[PDB]
Amino acid sequence: SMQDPIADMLTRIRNGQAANKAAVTMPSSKLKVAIANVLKEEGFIEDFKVEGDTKPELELTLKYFQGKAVVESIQRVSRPGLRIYKRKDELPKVMAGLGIAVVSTSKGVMTDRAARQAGLGGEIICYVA
């Protein structure tokens, strides 16, 4: 059964980019929306929107630069079978700082650089490069 909606979201992004889809659509959640906000702020996706009231649906508009997907790789790190938490001094660097790690901290979901600036550790949701 479905047991990791976040990995499902990441996989939808990965497969849509591989299939050259303009947009990808999925059932929504607040955590998915926070992750989408980080992706949009970092410029990996173009936009996102939530439609509906009782069964909210999140749509992500993917982007391509020169005929190539902007999201070169997106990978779940913490997972239900194995949670991963890092302290502030051990936050991972993705692609020598060229990529991002999405981190859930007590101040919300942000990138690894933002968590380092705030001086917080947290749960390593995924790597994006």
Partner: peptide, 11 residues
Amino acid sequence: NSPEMVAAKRG
């Protein structure tokens, strides 16, 4: 990848 390429592709 290089920082220039990463910046260009991410806008």
